[PDB]
Amino acid sequence: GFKQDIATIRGDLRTYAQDIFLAFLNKYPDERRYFKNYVGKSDQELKSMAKFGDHTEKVFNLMMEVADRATDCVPLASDANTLVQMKQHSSLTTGNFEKLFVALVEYMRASGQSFDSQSWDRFGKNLVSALSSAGMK
């Protein structure tokens, strides 16, 4: 289930983080505009950039902390607010987050692995609700 999925992802966090993030950019190529340092770079080029691995891992680490603190895929309002208030997220809208979770769920369903994809979809929906409540446009 969802708790096991957190363990699966955490076990190889950097690989899953990179693969899901690339799935996101591949599904929604226009989203690359928010990452000026990743524009015009192949996947292998990206993987050779210190910040790509470091930042992508740290994003997914925080995602997993939020997921683990949730009750029945309902995240803490405080966690949503952290995400809204981050300077790095100042120009984002809930639609950016919606897209990330659509891509994440698609990745899980396409994987040969037994992720609880329905729960990740619902977690994403609940997180979007919480972001909106915390003031994200």
Next chain:
Amino acid sequence: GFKQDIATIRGDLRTYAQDIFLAFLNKYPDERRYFKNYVGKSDQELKSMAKFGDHTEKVFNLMMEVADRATDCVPLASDANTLVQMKQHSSLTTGNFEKLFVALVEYMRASGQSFDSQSWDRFGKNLVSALSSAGMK
């Protein structure tokens, strides 16, 4: 994105090259008049010709180099000049290139592979502009 798509195509170039060129010829059958011995043949007959695959590979080898040398999907003017000046292209106009890129983008959109088709559309438009700047009719 675009840069990764170049790697994807290069990883199976003969297959992609033939399938895109066939998509072009099937969408625009009268374009066969620029070529020799292509009329009156089905796709499988074309693919079994001595030089169909070889010629198509050489075209797409160069197309991928032009794409790879581009910045933000803008090709080098030297690459455009080469394409205009090639003896093999003496009877072409920019419209021939426009049609090739319409077919290429349509192929990408229909494929099971996550191509950044919008970037290929932009690249095609920028290549056509560059061909015009370099003196193609």
